[PDB]
Design a protein around this motif. Structure first.
Motif, PDB file in Angstrom:
ATOM      1  N   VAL A  36       0.890  -1.012  -0.026  1.00 45.65           N
ATOM      2  CA  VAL A  36       0.362  -0.069   0.021  1.00 45.65           C
ATOM      3  C   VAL A  36       1.139   1.206  -0.402  1.00 45.65           C
ATOM      4  N   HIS A  37       0.392   2.160  -1.008  1.00 46.88           N
ATOM      5  CA  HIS A  37       1.093   3.462  -0.919  1.00 46.88           C
ATOM      6  C   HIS A  37       0.614   4.580  -1.065  1.00 46.88           C
ATOM      7  N   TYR A  38       1.319   5.764  -0.442  1.00 51.72           N
ATOM      8  CA  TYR A  38       0.193   6.513  -0.010  1.00 51.72           C
ATOM      9  C   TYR A  38       1.733   7.855  -1.080  1.00 51.72           C
ATOM     10  N   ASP A  39       0.724   8.805  -1.168  1.00 48.36           N
ATOM     11  CA  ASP A  39       1.407   9.572  -1.877  1.00 48.36           C
ATOM     12  C   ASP A  39       1.369  11.328  -0.627  1.00 48.36           C
ATOM     13  N   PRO A  60      -1.338  12.676   4.582  1.00 52.40           N
ATOM     14  CA  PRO A  60      -1.271  11.424   3.205  1.00 52.40           C
ATOM     15  C   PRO A  60      -2.214  12.101   2.099  1.00 52.40           C
ATOM     16  N   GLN A 115      -3.202  10.709  -2.734  1.00 56.63           N
ATOM     17  CA  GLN A 115      -3.969   9.764  -2.964  1.00 56.63           C
ATOM     18  C   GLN A 115      -3.053   8.672  -2.895  1.00 56.63           C
ATOM     19  N   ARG A 116      -3.827   7.850  -2.818  1.00 63.89           N
ATOM     20  CA  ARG A 116      -3.562   6.233  -2.862  1.00 63.89           C
ATOM     21  C   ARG A 116      -2.906   5.678  -3.985  1.00 63.89           C
ATOM     22  N   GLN A 117      -2.546   5.023  -4.041  1.00 61.64           N
ATOM     23  CA  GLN A 117      -1.752   4.228  -5.930  1.00 61.64           C
ATOM     24  C   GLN A 117      -2.479   2.583  -5.979  1.00 61.64           C
ATOM     25  N   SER A 118      -2.086   2.768  -7.042  1.00 64.62           N
ATOM     26  CA  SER A 118      -2.750   0.915  -7.341  1.00 64.62           C
ATOM     27  C   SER A 118      -1.723  -0.371  -6.943  1.00 64.62           C
ATOM     28  N   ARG A 129      -7.416  -2.315  -4.885  1.00 62.03           N
ATOM     29  CA  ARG A 129      -7.421  -2.306  -2.954  1.00 62.03           C
ATOM     30  C   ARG A 129      -7.100  -3.752  -2.382  1.00 62.03           C
ATOM     31  N   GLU A 180     -13.371  12.946   2.346  1.00 63.80           N
ATOM     32  CA  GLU A 180     -12.986  11.404   1.312  1.00 63.80           C
ATOM     33  C   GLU A 180     -14.300  10.490   0.926  1.00 63.80           C
TER      34      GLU A 180
END
Lengths: 116, 144, 49, 284, 284, 144, 144, 49, 49
Positions: free
Chosen positions: F33-36, F51, F53-56, F138, I1
C-alpha cells in the motif's frame, strides 16, 4: 448480382464460394511441407500451428465473422478425432476446418411515414 | 487414497522450428505478452483501470556456430529497404522421449532485427556462439 | 508468413531513401521539405442563414 | 568434424589414449607398462608404470542443444537420441638429477597430450588439454587418500556423445494429405453453454435448491462433425451434484438427445443436441 | 506424468534402481552382486560387487508449492499432505588394460543411468542423471574416510513425494446455505466506546482520581444480534484498575445491564446495554 | 512466572485463490500500500504534511508449467480492447496442518497486464516457470 | 544407424588480418549487425513493422604490447582533419591445425576512433595490454 | 476491437480540402512517410449508438 | 473522502456553453477519449461550510 446457380443456404453467394475455394487452396498449400515426415503427434501439431496462423491472419483481415477468433474458426487434427489407426498405417493425414463467413445485404427496405 | 502429484516440465525439453524447418537452438527467451494500462480518474473518487494496447514481441535466440552454417546471417542479410521475408516460429515442450508434444508457443510474422557474432577470445576454452533477435506480431500458447 | 512482394505492395514506404533531379541532372541531397499545396477559402453569407 | 555416437564411448576413448600414449612412450626403444587404474593402498611397484585414471564422468551441459528426433523415411525408423558425456583423466608416472627418467617420461606424455588436441581416433570430440589443476591442498588430500608420496600428474578432458536405446521401427511417413473445409455458425461456445445450463435449470424446476445443486456442474459443448436449418452439438456434463438431482439431470439429457427439436435459439441459430455424455458427473 | 505419494518412497526407489541395474548388468550372462551399503573399513572383497550408496536426503525446496489440502466430498475426508524428498545416490564398482572388467561394468551402469532419465518404476519422479561431481579434494577426503584406493563413481539424483500422516475423517461438506441481512445504525464503534467510558467516568464521580483509575481500562462494544427505538450492545471491559474502583465499575455495569433505559444518545440514536462482561478486568 | 514467547509465521505456509478457485502458486509478491505525501509551507515556518492519493496495486504471481494447464494465458488472452474479466485474489497464511487460517490478504478487481513465458535454456536442469502480473484496486489485511 | 554428431567450433581458433597483413590479436568483439524498426499504426488495428536503416559497425581489438611494436598507434596517429587510411578487416575461424579456414567475417572500410594504453599498475603481475576501437561500414559472414 | 460494433459516431457534413502536406524527405530519419490533408466543413454532430 | 460532507463551495451563476472540443483520434495513443466544454457566466461566489 452476386449469386451462384444453387439457391441454397450455403453457396448462395459468389463471395462465400470463392472465399471457401481460396481458403481450401491456401490450407492445402500451407500443410504440404509435412510430407515424408513422421505421421505422429509432432507433425500434426506443426500442421495445426500453420493452419491456425493462416486462419487467424484471414480473420484479422476481416474475411471471417465473429468478435474473437474462437467464434470464427476451429481446427481438428489427431488420433481418434480425424484419423484412425488404419488411416495412420497408410500414411494419410486428415484435418477438419470450420469457418464462418459474412453474407452481404441484398434488400434495403425504406418505410416512410408522416406522423414524425 | 492414492494422492497424485505432478511436477513441472523441465526447461531443457523443447524443440524449435523456424518457418517449416527444425533448427537446434541453445536458448530461447523473450516470449512475453505486455499490455499497457489506461487510467481515468473522477473528482468524486472513481478510478477506472483497463487494459490498453498490446505491445509487440521481442525474441532472442541463441545457438553455437557450426562449419558451413550461415542460415541466420543469410536471413538477416536479405533485407532490402523495408522488404524482408517474415517467418513463423514455434517452440514446443516435449516429453522425455521426445515423441510427444505437451505445450506449444506460437509466434507469427517474426523478422530479424539484430545479429550478434561470437566474441573471439583467445584466452577462453568455450564454444563460439551466435545470437539473433527477432521482432514479431503476437505470441499464443496452445496446450497439446 | 509474409513475402517481400506483399510488403512492396501493401506496406507503407519509409522516407529516407530518395533521389532528387534538378533540371537535366541529378544531385544528392540530405533533406527536402516544403512540398505543400495550399488553397484560400472564400466565404459568403446572407441574412437567411 | 563428425563424431559417431556410440554406446561404448568410454572404452573407445581409453583405446585412443592407449594408442597415442604407447606411440609417444615406446619411441625410445623402452617398454613402459600402461595401466588404467590406480595402484593399491601402500603397494609396491616392481616396474615403472604409467597410470591413466578416469576419475569423473558427468553430462556436459555446456554442449547440450535442443534438437528434434531424427527420422529416416526410407526405413520408417525414428533414430535414437544421444547424451553428451564429459570424461576427465589423470595421467601419472610411477617410479620402479634434472635429467631423470621421470622427467623424460612426463615430457613424452606432455608431448602426446599437446599434439593430440584433436584426438587421433576421435577427431570430432571436444577436448580440453592439460586444464588448470588444483591447488596444493587438493593434491595433498588426494595423495593422502592414495597413501603415497605426491607426484606430478597431467589432466585431460574429452566430451563424446553416447547413443540412447530409444528407437522406433514402424513410423510411417506422411504420403497422403486430405483436408475438408465446412461452414461454421457465428456463435460463441460460452453462450451456448450458458443457454443450455439455463434451460436445464428451468426444466429441473427453477427452485433455488436447483440453482444450488447446479453450482458445481460443468456443461460443455463440441461441434458435431456428422442439415442447414439447425446445428448439432456434443453435450458433455461433469461435476458434483446432490443425490436427488443426478438421475433427473441424466434423464433430461437423454430426453434432449432423443428429441430432434431445437432446445435453444441464440442469434437466430437453433441448437439441436445430437450426442450427450454424463458419466463423469459425481452425484454424492 | 503422475507419481503417487507414498510413505515408503526410499525402498521403492531402491527397488527401481535394483531392477534397472540388474537388467543392464546381468545382460552378458554374468551375475554381479548388488549391495545397498558401503563395504566396511579396510575390508576385503571375495567377489566383484556394485554398491548403491544413499548418502543424502533433504527436502526439495525448489519443487515446493503452496497448495491447499485436498478434499473428497464423497467420503467426507481431508486428504493428507505430502513432502517432497530429494535422494542422492553414489554407484561404484568394486573389484574382487583399456578393456578391463571395471570399464565394462561402469559402461553398463552408465548406459542404465543414461537410458533411465525417466525412471521405469517411477515415471513421474524428477531426476538429475550423472550431475557434476566434486573436485579431487573431495574425492580424496571421501576415500580417506573409506580407507581405500579411489575409484570412479557415478551420481544419481531423484525427487519423489512422501505422504504425510495428517488425515481428517469427518469433514462434512457444505449442503445448506442460509443468510440473513438486517439493518444497522449509522454509528461509529469508537464513538460509542468513548461515550460509554465518559458516562462511566461521570457516574463514578468525575474526580481526577477517577480519571487516573480509568486510564488503563478498555471498553469495547459489539452489536447484539438478538426493537426499533433503540439498539442493544454487548459491553466488554478489560484492563487494569485500582482496588477501590473495581467493585464500583462492576456494579455500574450490572446496573446498566439491569436498567432498560437508554444510557447514551449519539446522533439521535439511543444506546441500550443488554449484555455485559467484566471478568477480564484486573483490579490490583 | 511462565514467560510466553511467540515466533513469526513461516513465509511458505500460504494458500492462494484466484476468483473462486484455488491455484497452487510458487511465489506471490507486491502486496504493498502506497500513499503520496502532500506538503504545504508557510512563510512563518509552518510545514504541513498529510497523506495524499492512494496508488494502485501491482502484484506478480509465479508458478511452474504443467501439462494441459493454460488458465493464466487464457485469462490474459481474453482481452478485447478495454474489456477483461476482473477477479478477486485472496492469499491466506495458514497453520502447519493447513486446516486453519491465521491471516488473509484480500485483493479486489485484479486483471492481467503482462505474462512471462519460461526462459527455454537447453543448458539448465531447472523447472520451467511462468509468471503473470496483475493490476488491482485495493488490498486489505484481515486477521482471522 | 550411424548417428552423426557435430560440435561447435572453439572460440580461440581464429586468425585476424588488418589490411593485407596478419596481426596476432588477443580478443575481437563487437561484430554485430543492427537494424532499426519502423512502425506504423492504423486506426482500424493495422500494425506494420518493417526493418529500418542499418547501423554502422563498432569493433574493439585487444592485444598485448611488444618491444618495437607501434603499428596501431601509428595508424591512429596518422589522422589529419577528416583524412585517414581505411583498411579492411578479416577474422577467420580455422581448424585445429590452422591450415584450413572454416568461417570468415569480412569487415569493410574500418578506421580507428580510440586507442587505450595499458593501465600501469606497480602492484600487478599481469601483462601490459593495448586496445583499439574501429568504426566500419558493413560486416558480412562467408562460409568456406 | 474487431470493428463489428459501433460505440459513438462523429458526423462531418460537406467537407472539402483546403491544404495538403507532403512528407519531408530526410535521409537521417527512421519514420514512415506521412501525408496530411486539411478540410473545411459546415457542421459536426455526435451520435451515440 | 466519502463525499458525505462539504468543505467549501464555488457558485457560478447563469453559465452557457460557447465551445465544445471533441477527443482527437490517435492510433498510437494510450489515453482515454476526453471532451472539453467552455462556459461563460455572470459571477462566481465562494461560500464556506
Amino acid at each position: 448480382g452476386a449469386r451462384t446457380l444453387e439457391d441454397n443456404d450455403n453457396w448462395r453467394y459468389i463471395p462465400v464460394r470463392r472465399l471457401f475455394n481460396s481458403a481450401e487452396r491456401d490450407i492445402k498449400n500451407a500443410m504440404s511441407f509435412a510430407v515424408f515426415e513422421p505421421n505422429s503427434q509432432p507433425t500434426w501439431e506443426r500442421v495445426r500451428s500453420a493452419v491456425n496462423n493462416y486462419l487467424y491472419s484471414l480473420w484479422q483481415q476481416g474475411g471471417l465473422a465473429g468478435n474473437k477468433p474462437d467464434d470464427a474458426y476451429f481446427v481438428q487434427i489427431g488420433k481418434d478425432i480425424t484419423m484412425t489407426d488404419d488411416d495412420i498405417k497408410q500414411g494419410k493425414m486428415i484435418i477438419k476446418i470450420g469457418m464462418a463467413a459474412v453474407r452481404p445485404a441484398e434488400f434495403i427496405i425504406l418505410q416512410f411515414t408522416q406522423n414524425t | 487414497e492414492q494422492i497424485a502429484v505432478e511436477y513441472p516440465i523441465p526447461t531443457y525439453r523443447f524443440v524449435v522450428s523456424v518457418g517449416d524447418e527444425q533448427i537446434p537452438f541453445n536458448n530461447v527467451s523473450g516470449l512475453d505478452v505486455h499490455y499497457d494500462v489506461i487510467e481515468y480518474k473522477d473528482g468524486i473518487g472513481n478510478y477506472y483501470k483497463m487494459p490498453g494496447q498490446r505491445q509487440s514481441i521481442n525474441i532472442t535466440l541463441r545457438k553455437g556456430v557450426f562449419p558451413g552454417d550461415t542460415k541466420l546471417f543469410d536471413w538477416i542479410n536479405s533485407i532490402q529497404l523495408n522488404q524482408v521475408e517474415k517467418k513463423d516460429i514455434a517452440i514446443s515442450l516435449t516429453n522425455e522421449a521426445g515423441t510427444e508434444i505437451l505445450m506449444t508457443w506460437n509466434v507469427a510474422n517474426a523478422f530479424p532485427t539484430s545479429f550478434t557474432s561470437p566474441s573471439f577470445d583467445a584466452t577462453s576454452n568455450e564454444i563460439a556462439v551466435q545470437e539473433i533477435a527477432l521482432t514479431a506480431d503476437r505470441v499464443t500458447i496452445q496446450a497439446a | 508468413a509474409i513475402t517481400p512482394e506483399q510488403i512492396a505492395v501493401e506496406y507503407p514506404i519509409p522516407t529516407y531513401r530518395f533521389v532528387v533531379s534538378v533540371g537535366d541532372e541529378q544531385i544528392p541531397f540530405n533533406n527536402v521539405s516544403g512540398l505543400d499545396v495550399h488553397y484560400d477559402v472564400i466565404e459568403y453569407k446572407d441574412g437567411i442563414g | 568434424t563428425i563424431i559417431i555416437a556410440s554406446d561404448n564411448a568410454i572404452i573407445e576413448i581409453n583405446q585412443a589414449l592407449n594408442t597415442i600414449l604407447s606411440q609417444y612412450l615406446n619411441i625410445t626403444g623402452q617398454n613402459i607398462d600402461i595401466r588404467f587404474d590406480l595402484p593399491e593402498i601402500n603397494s609396491i611397484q616392481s616396474e615403472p608404470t604409467v597410470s591413466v585414471f578416469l576419475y569423473e564422468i558427468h553430462e556436459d551441459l555446456q554442449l547440450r542443444s535442443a534438437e528434434s528426433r531424427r527420422y529416416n523415411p526410407s526405413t520408417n525408423t525414428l533414430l535414437p537420441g544421444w547424451v553428451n558425456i564429459n570424461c576427465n583423466y589423470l595421467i601419472t608416472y610411477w617410479d620402479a638429477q634434472p635429467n631423470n627418467q621421470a622427467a623424460q617420461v612426463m615430457t613424452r606424455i606432455l608431448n602426446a597430450l599437446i599434439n593430440n588436441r584433436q584426438l587421433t581416433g576421435l577427431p570430432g570430440a571436444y577436448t580440453r588439454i592439460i586444464p588448470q589443476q588444483e591447488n596444493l591442498n587438493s593434491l595433498g588430500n588426494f595423495w593422502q587418500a592414495l597413501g603415497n608420496r605426491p607426484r606430478l600428474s597431467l589432466l585431460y578432458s574429452i566430451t563424446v556423445p553416447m547413443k540412447l536405446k530409444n528407437i522406433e521401427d514402424n513410423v510411417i511417413p506422411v504420403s497422403k494429405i486430405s483436408a475438408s473445409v465446412d461452414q461454421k455458425p457465428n456463435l460463441d461456445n460460452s453462450q451456448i453453454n450458458q443457454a443450455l445450463i439455463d434451460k436445464l435449470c428451468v426444466e429441473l424446476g427453477g427452485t433455488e435448491d436447483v440453482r444450488l445443486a447446479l453450482a458445481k456442474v460443468n456443461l460443455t459443448t463440441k461441434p458435431d462433425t456428422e442439415n442447414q436449418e439447425n446445428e448439432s452439438v456434443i453435450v458433455e456434463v461433469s461435476g458434483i451434484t446432490s443425490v436427488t438431482y443426478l438421475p433427473q439431470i441424466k434423464d433430461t439429457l437423454t430426453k434432449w438427445k432423443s428429441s430432434q427439436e431445437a432446445i435453444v435459439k441464440i442469434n437466430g441459430v437453433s441448437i439441436v443436441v445430437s450426442k450427450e455424455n454424463a458419466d463423469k458427473l459425481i452425484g454424492i
